Amino acid sequence: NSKILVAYFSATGTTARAAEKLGAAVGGDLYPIAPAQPYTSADLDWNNKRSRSSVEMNDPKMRPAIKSKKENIGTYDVVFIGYPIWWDLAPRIINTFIEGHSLKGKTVVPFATSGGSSIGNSATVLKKTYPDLNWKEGRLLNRTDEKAIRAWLDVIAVK
Numbered sequence: 001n002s003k004i005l006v007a008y009f010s011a012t013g014t015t016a017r018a019a020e021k022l023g024a025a026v027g028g029d030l031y032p033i034a035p036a037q038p039y040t041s042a043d044l045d046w047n048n049k050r051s052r053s054s055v056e057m058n059d060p061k062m063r064p065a066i067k068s069k070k071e072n073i074g075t076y077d078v079v080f081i082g083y084p085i086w087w088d089l090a091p092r093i094i095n096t097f098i099e100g101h102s103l104k105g106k107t108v109v110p111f112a113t114s115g116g117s118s119i120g121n122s123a124t125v126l127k128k129t130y131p132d133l134n135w136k137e138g139r140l141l142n143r144t145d146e147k148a149i150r151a152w153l154d155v156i157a158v159k
């Protein structure tokens with residue numbers, strides 16, 4: 001079976017909890033993608049056009065800095081990449097992660113939490129941005145359990 005990493009960004013814990021359930025289900029290592037500068041509540045104010053998150057989402061070239069890379073990334077066969085949905089997209093720190101780690105040859109699978117939006121748009125944009133990677137279809141994990149995770153992974157043929 002594969003060596004599995006569950007990489008994730010979480011600003012308020014929701015995606016971290018999804019990631020923990022996923023990693024427990026598959027016996028995967030978890031890698032929290034930690035921002036070098038933590039996100040405050042003010043940063044996350046989507047009603048303020050001048051908030052850090054609004055400015056990020058308006059600049060597709062922005063690459064929020066990550067504290068520490070995953071040093072043994074080379075050892076993994078499958079890398080799940082989790083995030084909260086921000087304006088129907090992956091947060092830009094996900095781009096920082098992808099661009100800073102060699103994911104060539106690996107199976108790469110997004111997952112997300114949200115306030116209602118589906119994962120599809122964010123996953124489509126990531127696949128189009130990084131078309132050389134081996135992307136598989138991901139899931140919104142707002143409400144999940146081991147049985148649902150296992151069914152998903154059988155559909156996409158990850159083991």
Ligand SMILES: Cc1cc2nc3c(=O)[nH]c(=O)nc-3n(C[C@H](O)[C@H](O)[C@H](O)COP(=O)(O)O)c2cc1C
Binds near residue numbers: 012089113
């Ligand atoms: C800046 C910002 C933008 C968001 N945009 C969306 C959105 O487009 N659609 C949606 O359903 N939820 C949106 N949300 C809600 C988050 O996706 C949701 O609360 C997620 O579970 C937060 O995960 P976390 O606790 O790991 O940070 C947004 C939240 C923030 C802070």
